[PDB]
Ligand binder design. Structure first.
Ligand SMILES: CCCCCCCCCCCCCC(=O)SCCNC(=O)CCNC(=O)[C@@H](O)C(C)(C)COP(=O)(O)O
Ligand code: SF4
Ligand code: SF4
Ligand code: FES
Ligand SMILES: [K+]
Ligand SMILES: [Zn+2]
Lengths: 126, 48, 86, 208, 688, 114, 90, 95
């Protein structure tokens, strides 16, 4: 046979070596990142990300730098689909919540609408 | 620098200081920025 | 001591909420006329099972399932709530 | 496109494509993909049950003689359900060529150890255990090789943070170097450097 | 279907007639470069960066404006397409100043990025560049016009979406300059979005200026709480400090815009903050103390209360977690006196049915309407992106809008019916001419402002507007899925406070005053110490010390909206959660944490410990507060109308005057805006 | 759901390996306390072994507990052979770490962590 | 030569400009050459009439043409700066 | 152009000084707070405004490739000088 039947939910939290504080009290956020409205490019909105809740960042007493105690504060993962991301979060015992992908709705663009006879959609200048 | 002198600037140190580490003139780091969050100062008058 | 608020949750389209919807369409107006200062919080949602929350004095909340009821069973459960004040 | 563009090696591309056909039809039990890159490198993508037949074939066949294991590598790709990609870089001294053998596993399925094929692999797949957690079955001495002795987790996984979970310092009370939870005086400042504009249209993934 | 077949690089794709070449290439996952094109603005076609080759056609077409003909093969990666791109990028960069290090757009510049992606790598421009005089258009938008590439997204935004028509191009040729031509101060309610749609550094944010840089910022996706629109934002932070607020795209709310209050009131968030607990000392002054002392002094007074002796006002900026926290806490004392600042009338159904206090149609339902009646609201300043949706429907769908109220500027043209509330009775009888317009309307839409419900006769106004809505919907050709009655709120805390069952308005505190009062961020000044008894124990729990804090006995420093993950419900019933961008300053804590710790000190411990358990409670009170980015429809308008006909309330003779008449009254409404120096510069600039 | 095993076909063989690994650690603990010259007692180290074994007592997958037995044998091999020093063995006993706040109220007092 | 405007004592929006009444009749005749709904098409002839009255265009002829045609003043400023016959200087 | 707080502590060109009750003044106790006394805002204010006769001038900070990128400064505003965004040298059109 050399193949066994495991009917259990895939949970590898004992194997990853992560402490229990950063497993059971963290909230993953599974999302497609929003487009930077400073720019018209949409290439950064293609993949699913997993980040975590931002914990405390305090001031360094010596230099004023941003000190942290959160190890997972820089941890951003990248997934092809939402379901891969959810499977990875459930496999590692992370509590997650999922925003659906926001695509821009299709627009009806008409350059002739800018010069209409009887509609309000005339441009006053060009 | 006796032959080819360094180009004079008004901000260059005229008095070169050596390594002052371990002396009272040593460098102590500090944050050069100001306070970020301004706190609410409660009024010094009573509330009755 | 006594009843403080009644919460009614329901779906807009589920058949399990059909009795709750048929209660709110007919009997809620004379319920609110009979109970002028009682908050009766009808809170529709998308996929919930129907539910009758009743908050009494000192934060004590009883929980009644209204799933697959008729309007008559919702009227009987709600008048049991209004008659208890427990 | 003469001075600044890398010149394409068409002869080696054709030769490595023909040899990839050769390996794919000698071993169709395990070979899944065969791909030749634009810079003329041959990848054989196999099923992990054929680690020992494919590597033993490439080591011992008269038209292969890949006697040298250059490197053995895992790559963690978390969006794949078989997230670990075990890469074998082989070197032929007889035919002056290199071949890449690639296979997959997740955290729990073991890969068969290849020390019976290459004794070079003894520390490499032990490093893959230490850094990724990929267990290699029927290994002579599989244990950690690079991390500290009490170390928890596998550092080259991509869900493992850059600074880890514990840090060390000497403590004068217990007269002992101790492990305490990690706190940075300055956090590692993450830079979102990726451009919002597509750079390579030839690599565009098709939409859903 | 009438779909035509076009080809993008040979790949077949079925597009609608009227599709441009750019949209046809977007459907296969290819993004054509652009500078003047923007999918929410009218098409300009005047930067020529989108020039693509159609095969068997000896001329490159402007892909933003050219409709696809059937059978075209669009060659997005061909050689003369790339030659067109490199030539146009060469002309774009010929007179562009070498300002990339001193530019705030650097690192997030479209001109930089698609010069890297599509331009050449060097210059042939051996001449002297031009220099354009800088324009002064206000305290918000810094203007450096040498960086202008004359894409005219300015003029199209201010002409179409902002509705101002006061930007333009003066001059001609290379001397053509974008500006106002006079020393004019462009102060719209949406005037900071030209920072967003300027692709280059010609229009930057003057408060954000020089401070940060885009790669080092951490983008946290959160919610606006400055108004009841629920605008989705990115709070970008750098090293534990909030740097700016950018919009998120959400097609149903704020499409990709935000208001100037949303964009620029984040610097009141770092002034006047409550950082430590305060109690009154022996002299009667507020001195700093620990959480143990402050929570013990609140809990000792809470244990000595029962019934109407303890009350709570919820302010404008309070999340549903703290709302249900203080509700459960005061119900452990058996106190139902939980109030909001913003008065909503409780006659009839009151807040029992959700359909009589929501924007029941949607924000996106403005696009479907054909007639809009606006009663007693100034939606330009109460909810600026709801007004932006009305202007977009006005422009594109030829929407008829009528206002009952003071004749405010709304950035479009409406039929001003007048300001007396007797017009609501005239429309409800049919003797008014606009009543026949509402009857013949296919999708009419009547919006009552929540500032009109602040009057003493707010119940009569609500009954009259509901009477108009039910005279239309139950009789005319309204479909039935279409909701007519709508209420536009202006307060982010309000709708979730009504769903959790608070009593709207502070009339139940003036009716019987308590000996202990909670103020969750209550800075409206609705109930001061002249209304309470002799020594009321006022506990202010908030994040700014503005109004409710100097009269408080114990001060509890809370988190702000950038500082907590927190459920807010907008004016249309969509529940939304913020995310933690930064942590609260000093000893300030999250709000329901404070209320739950207060319950643990008082010996009336609340049955939740983590935020997930607070949200399980929040689902128990109304299960649509945990279904995020979901509008749940509310039926039963007929039953609320029948309940509204019971007690006949009379209309006062005072005309409908919204409180925000001009741009002056816009910039400071809540405790974060009043603490903002940028909003202070806005108010000072619009008065002079 | 047909997966290749590591050592155990099902959970009974897996518990056999858990049980033999526990026997090996229980025999080893007096030697570890002696030759590392730890300041703990043998009962205290055995309680720590029982704590580490009861930490993973929820696992129902045979492959996961096969890997747990493998990593426990690796820890044992690093402890029998003197590869660990005294510090690596005493890192199980979090002695210099301050006691963390447990209930809601003390966690509220010190900070923002849930 | 500058395509921005600055308020000088000789040229400001309080500089007195108004059409003569026969110029108002000529403006009525100009506006009646264009369709109803496109009164904004009469910006160039009425602004040229303002220049032929006054000799040049202060920024009160531009504002008066913007008022009597109900167009935004920026859309008259654009036309006055675009075309080379309109003398923005005396 | 360094000024001094009432605590005696020098103030940097940023404006940074520690408060009277801030404990972090103890790092300078027995040592020194190192400030630079050549304030750039005072030194660039001492440079005279360059009178030029062109409508657009260029600045690269002096030295060619040793300065900053060459930027072009408009001088149409007669009320205000034209200031370089990099080096802070300011220019005036003489007519
Ligand atoms: C000096 C300090 C030395 C520290 C030594 C640390 C070594 C840690 C080794 C850990 C190895 C493991 O965790 S294997 C245990 C995982 N086993 C399971 O998940 C199966 C469940 N196991 C059980 O329930 C076990 O109690 C038993 C004994 C197998 C059966 O008990 P139940 O019956 O009631
Ligand atoms: S707008 Fe863009 S290209 Fe121009 S100076 Fe700024 S960053 Fe550079
Ligand atoms: S300032 Fe910016 S948005 Fe406006 S026309 Fe110039 S480049 Fe376009
Ligand atoms: S994008 Fe088509 S020309 Fe500007
Ligand atoms: K910009
Ligand atoms: Zn310079």
């Amino acid at each position: 046979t050399q193949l066994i039947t495991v009917d259990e939910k895939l949970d590898i939290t004992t194997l990853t070596g992560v402490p229990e504080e950063h497993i059971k009290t963290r909230k993953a956020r599974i999302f497609v990142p929003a487009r930077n409205n400073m720019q018209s490019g949409v290439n950064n909105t293609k993949k699913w990300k997993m980040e975590f809740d931002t914990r405390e960042r305090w001031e360094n007493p010596l230099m004023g730098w941003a000190s942290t105690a959160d190890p997972l504060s820089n941890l951003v993962l990248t997934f092809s689909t939402k379901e891969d991301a959810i499977a990875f979060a459930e496999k590692n015992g992370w509590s997650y919540d999922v925003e659906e992908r926001k695509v821009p709705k299709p627009k009806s663009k008409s350059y002739g609408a800018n010069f209409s006879w009887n509609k309000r959609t005339r441009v006053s200048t060009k | 620098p006796t032959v080819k002198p360094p180009t004079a600037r008004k901000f260059i140190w005229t008095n070169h200081k050596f390594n002052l580490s371990g002396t009272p003139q040593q460098y102590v780091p500090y944050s050069t920025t100001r306070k970020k969050i301004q706190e609410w100062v409660p009024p010094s008058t009573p509330y009755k | 001591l006594g009843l403080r608020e009644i919460r009614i949750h329901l779906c807009q389209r589920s058949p399990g909420s059909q009795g709750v919807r048929d209660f709110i369409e007919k009997r809620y107006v004379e319920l609110k006329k009979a109970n002028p200062d009682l908050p009766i919080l009808i809170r529709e949602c998308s996929d919930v099972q129907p539910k009758l929350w009743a908050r009494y004095a000192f934060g004590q909340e009883k929980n009644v399932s209204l799933n697959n009821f008729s309007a008559d069973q919702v009227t009987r459960a709600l008048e049991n709530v209004l008659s208890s004040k427990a | 496109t003469r001075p600044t563009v890398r010149p394409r090696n068409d002869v080696a591309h054709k030769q490595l494509s023909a040899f990839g056909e050769y390996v794919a039809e000698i071993l169709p039990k395990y070979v899944q993909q065969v791909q030749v890159s634009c810079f003329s490198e041959l990848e054989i993508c196999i099923h992990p049950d054929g680690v020992i037949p494919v590597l033993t074939f490439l080591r011992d066949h008269s038209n292969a003689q890949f006697k040298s294991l250059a490197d053995l590598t895992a790559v963690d790709i978390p969006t794949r359900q078989n997230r670990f990609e075990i890469v074998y870089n082989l070197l032929s001294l007889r035919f002056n060529s290199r071949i890449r053998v690639k296979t997959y596993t997740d955290e729990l399925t073991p890969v068969e150890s290849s020390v019976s094929v290459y004794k070079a692999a003894n520390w490499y797949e032990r490093e893959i255990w230490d850094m990724f957690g990929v267990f290699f079955a029927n290994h002579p001495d599989l244990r950690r090789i690079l991390t500290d002795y009490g170390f928890e987790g596998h550092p080259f996984r991509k869900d493992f943070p850059l600074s880890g979970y514990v840090e060390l310092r000497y403590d004068d009370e217990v007269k002992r170097v101790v492990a305490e939870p990690v706190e940075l005086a300055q956090e590692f400042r993450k830079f979102d450097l990726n451009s919002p504009w597509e750079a390579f249209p030839a690599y565009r993934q098709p939409p859903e | 279907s009438n779909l035509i077949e076009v080809f993008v690089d040979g790949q077949s794709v079925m597009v609608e007639p009227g599709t441009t070449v750019l949209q046809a290439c977007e459907k296969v996952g290819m993004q054509i470069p652009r500078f003047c094109y923007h999918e929410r603005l009218s098409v300009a076609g005047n930067c020529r960066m989108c020039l693509v080759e159609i095969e068997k056609a000896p001329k490159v077409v402007a892909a933003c404006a050219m409709p696809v003909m059937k059978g075209w093969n669009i060659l997005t990666n061909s050689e003369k397409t790339k030659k067109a791109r490199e030539g146009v990028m060469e002309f774009l960069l010929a007179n562009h100043p070498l300002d990339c290090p001193i530019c705030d757009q650097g690192g997030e510049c479209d001109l930089q990025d698609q010069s890297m992606m599509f331009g050449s790598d060097r210059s042939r421009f051996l001449e002297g560049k031009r220099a354009v005089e800088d324009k002064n258009i206000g305290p918000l938008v810094k203007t450096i016009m040498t960086r202008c590439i004359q894409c005219t997204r300015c003029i199209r935004f201010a002409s179409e979406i902002a509705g101002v028509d006061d930007l333009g191009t003066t001059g001609r040729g290379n001397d053509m300059q974008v500006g106002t031509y006079i020393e004019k101060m462009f102060m719209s309610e949406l005037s900071g979005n030209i920072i967003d749609i300027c692709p280059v550094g010609a229009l930057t944010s003057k408060p954000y200026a020089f401070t940060a840089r885009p790669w080092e910022t951490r983008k946290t996706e959160s919610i606006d709480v400055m108004d009841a629109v629920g605008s989705n934002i990115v709070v970008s932070t750098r090293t534990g400090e909030v740097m700016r607020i950018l919009p998120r795209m959400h097609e149903d709310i704020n499409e990709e815009w935000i208001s100037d209050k949303t964009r620029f009131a984040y610097d009141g968030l770092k002034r006047q903050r409550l950082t430590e607990p305060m109690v009154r000392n022996e002299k009667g002054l507020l001195t700093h103390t620990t959480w143990e002392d402050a929570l013990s002094r609140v809990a000792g007074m809470l244990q000595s209360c029962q019934g109407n002796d303890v009350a709570a006002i919820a302010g404008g900026l309070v999340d549903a977690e703290a709302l249900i926290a203080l509700k459960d806490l005061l119900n452990r004392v058996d106190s139902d006196t939980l109030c909001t600042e913003e008065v909503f009338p409780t006659a009839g159904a009151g807040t029992d049915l959700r359909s009589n206090y929501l924007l029941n149609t949607t924000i996106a339902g403005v696009e479907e309407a054909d007639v809009v009646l606006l009663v007693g609201t100034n939606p330009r300043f109460e909810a600026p992106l709801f007004n932006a949706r009305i202007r977009k429907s006005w422009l594109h769908n030829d929407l008829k809008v009528a206002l009952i109220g003071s004749p405010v500027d709304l950035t479009y043209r409406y039929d001003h019916l007048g300001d007396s509330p007797k017009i609501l009775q005239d429309i409800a009888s049919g003797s008014h001419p606009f009543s026949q317009v509402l009857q013949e309307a296919k999708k009419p839409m009547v919006v009552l402002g929540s500032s009109a419900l602040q009057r003493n006769d707010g119940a009569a106004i609500l009954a009259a507007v509901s009477n108009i809505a039910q005279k239309i919907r139950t009789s005319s050709g309204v479909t039935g899925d279409w909701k007519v009655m709508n209420i536009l709120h202006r307060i982010a805390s309000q709708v979730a406070a009504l769903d959790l069952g608070y009593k709207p308005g502070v009339e139940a505190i003036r009716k019987n005053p308590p000996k202990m009062l909670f103020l969750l961020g209550a800075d409206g000044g609705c109930v001061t110490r002249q209304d309470l008894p002799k020594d009321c124990f006022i506990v202010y729990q908030g994040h700014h010390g503005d109004v409710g804090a100097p009269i408080a006995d114990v001060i509890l420093p809370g988190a702000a909206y950038t500082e907590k993950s927190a459920t807010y419900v907008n004016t249309e019933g969509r529940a939304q959660q913020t995310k933690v961008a930064v942590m609260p300053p000093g000893l300030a804590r999250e709000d329901w944490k404070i209320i739950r710790a207060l319950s643990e000190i008082a010996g009336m411990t609340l049955p939740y410990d983590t935020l997930d358990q607070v949200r399980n409670r929040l689902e128990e009170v109304s299960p649509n507060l945990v279904r995020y980015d979901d509008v749940e429809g509310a039926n039963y308008f007929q039953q609320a109308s029948e309940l509204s006909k019971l007690v006949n309330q009379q209309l006062l003779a005072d005309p409908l005057v919204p409180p925000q008449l001009t741009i002056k009254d816009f910039y400071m409404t809540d405790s974060i805006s009043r603490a903002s120096q940028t909003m202070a510069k806005c108010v000072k600039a619009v008065t002079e | 759901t047909s997966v290749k095993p590591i050592f155990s076909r099902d959970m009974n063989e897996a518990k056999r390996r858990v049980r033999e690994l526990y026997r090996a650690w229980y025999r080893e603990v007096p030697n570890t306390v002696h030759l590392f010259q730890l300041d703990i007692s043998v009962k205290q180290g055995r309680d720590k072994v029982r704590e580490m074994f009861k930490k993973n007592a929820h696992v129902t997958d045979p492959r996961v507990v096969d890997l747990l037995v493998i990593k426990g044998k690796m820890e044992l091999e690093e402890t029998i052979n003197v590869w660990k020093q005294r510090t690596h063995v005493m890192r199980f006993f979090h002695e210099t770490e301050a006691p963390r706040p447990k209930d809601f109220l003390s966690k509220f007092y010190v900070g923002h962590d849930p | 030569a500058l395509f921005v405007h600055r308020d000088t004592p000789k040229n400001n929006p309080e500089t007195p400009f108004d059409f003569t009444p026969e110029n108002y009749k000529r403006i009525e005749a100009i506006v009646k050459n264009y369709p109803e709904g496109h009164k904004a098409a009469a910006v160039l002839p009425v602004l040229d009439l303002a220049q032929r009255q006054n000799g040049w265009l202060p920024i009160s002829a531009m504002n008066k043409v913007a008022e009597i045609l109900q167009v935004p003043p920026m859309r008259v400023y654009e036309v006055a700066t675009f075309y080379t016959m309109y003398n923005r200087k005396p | 152009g360094v000024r001094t707080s009432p605590t005696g502590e020098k103030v940097t060109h940023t404006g940074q000084v520690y408060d009277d009750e801030d404990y972090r003044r103890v790092r300078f106790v027995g040592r020194q707070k190192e400030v630079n006394e050549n304030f750039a805002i005072d030194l660039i204010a001492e440079q005279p405004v360059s009178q030029v006769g062109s409508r657009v001038i260029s600045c690269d900070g002096g030295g060619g490739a040793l300065g900053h990128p060459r930027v072009y400064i408009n001088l149409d505003k007669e009320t205000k000088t034209g200031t370089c965004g990099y080096c802070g040298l300011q220019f005036r059109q003489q007519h």
